[PDB]
Amino acid sequence: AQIGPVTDLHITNANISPDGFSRPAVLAGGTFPGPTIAGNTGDNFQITVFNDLTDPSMLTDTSIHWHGLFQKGTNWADGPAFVTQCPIITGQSFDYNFNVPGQAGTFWYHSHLSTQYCDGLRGPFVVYDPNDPNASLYDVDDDTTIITLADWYHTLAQQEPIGAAITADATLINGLGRSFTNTTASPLSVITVQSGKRYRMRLVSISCDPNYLFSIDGHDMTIIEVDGVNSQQLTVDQIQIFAAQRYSFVLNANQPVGNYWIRAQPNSGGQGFDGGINSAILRYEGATVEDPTTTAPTTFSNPLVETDLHPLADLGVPGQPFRGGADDPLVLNLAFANGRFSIDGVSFVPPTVPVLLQILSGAQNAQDLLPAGSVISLPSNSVIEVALPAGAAGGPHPFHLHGHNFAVVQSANNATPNYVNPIWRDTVSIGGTGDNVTIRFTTNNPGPWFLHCHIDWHLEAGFAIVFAEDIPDTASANPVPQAWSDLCPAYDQAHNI
Numbered sequence: 214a215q216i217g218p219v220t221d222l223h224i225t226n227a228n229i230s231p232d233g234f235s236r237p238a239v240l241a242g243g244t245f246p247g248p249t250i251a252g253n254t255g256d257n258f259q260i261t262v263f264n265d266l267t268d269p270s271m272l273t274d275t276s277i278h279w280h281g282l283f284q285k286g287t288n289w290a291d292g293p294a295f296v297t298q299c300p301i302i303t304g305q306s307f308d309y310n311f312n313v314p315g316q317a318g319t320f321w322y323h324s325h326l327s328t329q330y331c332d333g334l335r336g337p338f339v340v341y342d343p344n345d346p347n348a349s350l351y352d353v354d355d356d357t358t359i360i361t362l363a364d365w366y367h368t369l370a371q372q373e374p375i376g377a378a379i380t381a382d383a384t385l386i387n388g389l390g391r392s393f394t395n396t397t398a399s400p401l402s403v404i405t406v407q408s409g410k411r412y413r414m415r416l417v418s419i420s421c422d423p424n425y426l427f428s429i430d431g432h433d434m435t436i437i438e439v440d441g442v443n444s445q446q447l448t449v450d451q452i453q454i455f456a457a458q459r460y461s462f463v464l465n466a467n468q469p470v471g472n473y474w475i476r477a478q479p480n481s482g483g484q485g486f487d488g489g490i491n492s493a494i495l496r497y498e499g500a501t502v503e504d505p506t507t508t509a510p511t512t513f514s515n516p517l518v519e520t521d522l523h524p525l526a527d528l529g530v531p532g533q534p535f536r537g538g539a540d541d542p543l544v545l546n547l548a549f550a551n552g553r554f555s556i557d558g559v560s561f562v563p564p565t566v567p568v569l570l571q572i573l574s575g576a577q578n579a580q581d582l583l584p585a586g587s588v589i590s591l592p593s594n595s596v597i598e599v600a601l602p603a604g605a606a607g608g609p610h611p612f613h614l615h616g617h618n619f620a621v622v623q624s625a626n627n628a629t630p631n632y633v634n635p636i637w638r639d640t641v642s643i644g645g646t647g648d649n650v651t652i653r654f655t656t657n658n659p660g661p662w663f664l665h666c667h668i669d670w671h672l673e674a675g676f677a678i679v680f681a682e683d684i685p686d687t688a689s690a691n692p693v694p695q696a697w698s699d700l701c702p703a704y705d706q707a708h709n710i
């Protein structure tokens with residue numbers, strides 16, 4: 214069952230063994246992944262999060278972010294710890310009460326305190342459209358068509374030793390998969406289809422780090438949505454999906470009744486499919502209950518290339534059709550050294566007072582805001598351009614902007630900008646050395662919006678900045694409930710701050 218749009222959500226510790234190895238975890242709704250939160254476009258979500266965490270090895274505080282939802286007028290509900298709230302302490306609850314006007318598509322929810330989402334607090338979040346312009350392209354779209362891709366670690370997130378390399382121990386597809394080392398034949402996930410029907414598969418990366426090469430033996434995939442944005446139909450046989458991205462694709466169950474490998478190849482950790490790692494099973498009704506015997510091609514025929522995507526709607530691009538053709542053109546210097554990332558020479562360290570609270574308390578320029586140099590003001594009602602040139606170690610880095618989606622004016626591995634019809638999305642690979650991935654948006658959403666690499670280990674190591682969008686209007690635009698005002702006093706009392 215899907216839950217929502219008005220629902221309780223309990224956060225707990227428990228042991229799980231998704232790849233056969235037992236470890237404690239941080240769970241929403243008692244499961245990994247968490248339950249799908251869903252509603253319809255424009256609905257009021259009220260998600261009352263109960264923090265019932267008792268195991269300090271994975272932190273007993275928490276904060277949840279509703280990834281890709283714009284939160285206009287509810288910046289207080291966005292989730293990122295010390296940007297928009299103080300964390301919820303154990304034994305307390307908090308009602309994330311917000312609305313989703315003008316959005317429909319595939320999203321997700323995750324802890325946004327430290328690297329706690331790696332420990333398990335990650336789930337899908339779907340906003341259906343009763344008048345979906347893509348409705349007629351498929352027959353089935355429900356909880357059974359959601360496909361999550363997750364990295365899973367046997368070492369707890371807080372206990373990753375500083376100075377050693379971090380790689381995962383299993384790829385989990387719909388919460389199951391097999392360990393890269395000491396592989397056991399634990400259960401694989403099964404996605405069931407009926408011969409002749411068409412399915413809106415909602416492909417969600419809930420990854421803390423690796424990108425996946427996703428494919429389904431014998432099948433192709435027709436992409437119709439990119440991070441919440443309806444796309445023209447694009448048929449591909451493989452999708453490279455970066456951390457926090459979503460695609461919907463039409464799967465036509467048009468192959469012979471049988472079993473077909475679903476493949477998700479991470480860019481780090483175990484390479485290949487030996488022992489059934491990196492795999493799930495696509496099973497047609499009436500097939501024998503047995504593993505697929507299919508194989509991948511040596512080379513895929515039609516891999517997704519981001520420049521091939523275009524919006525279904527005539528979304529265009531704001532500003533002028535050249536570099537710097539914006540009201541506020543920015544170029545970020547994105548760097549890594551000595552274990553820390555930095556943006557324009559500053560490494561993000563979360564402040565003691567959340568940025569939003571600072572602004573509501575009367576700090577009214579970005580140079581008054583802490584951390585110093587990590588908060589950049591944006592002017593209201595203006596076209597913003599942000600070039601994100603790559604080269605920092607640990608790439609390719611998927612950059613994500615809260616409160617907004619954006620036109621991808623230039624994509625990875627292609628020096629040509631597109632000022633006519635590029636895809637809009639909310640998380641984008643900035644590519645490789647020499648690249649100049651560039652985004653554009655307009656500022657019609659007052660508040661502090663986080664911008665950061667979505668590799669959670671990089672965010673923890675400082676690869677972030679806060680855009681304080683329309684500081685003058687932030688208080689008037691984002692009235693705050695008493696419960697929100699109560700968070701920082703309660704958090705600060707519980708931690709003796």
Ligand SMILES: *[C@@H]1O[C@H](CO)[C@@H](O[C@@H]2O[C@H](CO)[C@@H](O)[C@H](O)[C@H]2NC(C)=O)[C@H](O)[C@H]1NC(C)=O
Pocket residue numbers: 536537542543544600602647648649651
């Ligand atoms: C990425 O594109 C940006 C513009 O969006 C480039 O910014 C220019 O940088 C040069 C210095 O290299 C300055 O003289 C200009 O003021 C910048 N803005 C312009 C021309 O609009 C940036 O160099 C590009 N970076 C890479 C690595 O290609």
Ligand SMILES: *[C@@H]1O[C@H](CO)[C@@H](O[C@@H]2O[C@H](CO)[C@@H](O)[C@H](O)[C@H]2NC(C)=O)[C@H](O)[C@H]1NC(C)=O
Pocket residue numbers: 518520521627628629630631632
């Ligand atoms: C590199 O990116 C550019 C810009 O997004 C792509 O160029 C466009 O190509 C399409 C399809 O051929 C044409 O309809 C557009 O007119 C082009 N726009 C521009 C601004 O050139 C290009 O195809 C990409 N390269 C590859 C190899 O995919």
Ligand SMILES: [Cu+2]
Pocket residue numbers: 278280281323457667
């Ligand atoms: Cu996210």
Ligand SMILES: [Cu+2]
Pocket residue numbers: 278279280281613614615616
């Ligand atoms: Cu987000």
Ligand SMILES: [Cu+2]
Pocket residue numbers: 607608609610611666667668671672676
């Ligand atoms: Cu990164």
Ligand SMILES: [Cu+2]
Pocket residue numbers: 278293325613615663665
């Ligand atoms: Cu974030």
